[PDB]
Amino acid sequence: SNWLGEDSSAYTQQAMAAAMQAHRYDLQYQLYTLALHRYLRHRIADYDY
């Protein structure tokens, strides 16, 4: 949940892509995927990404 997008046109695939780089949320991608991969390699035997 975030800022007051008073019009529905302020939540399109370009506005969110701009806000992704403007708030640097792209690090969470790799960090969370690595964290979940390191857990799957311990839980599931014969795991393929």
């Binding site: 690595l34 964290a35 390191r38 857990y39």
Partner: protein, 49 residues
Amino acid sequence: QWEPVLTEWITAVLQAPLNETGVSLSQLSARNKQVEMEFYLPISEPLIA
């Protein structure tokens, strides 16, 4: 007085077509979910930015 607005907003957000499969979260049972995980990643060799 926020109740009629919220009770349709929840139903609107609970039925989205996410990724062409596993969409519309109401078709997910309790055996297939795990909420609020917490992890720990030990890192050596100090991370240069």
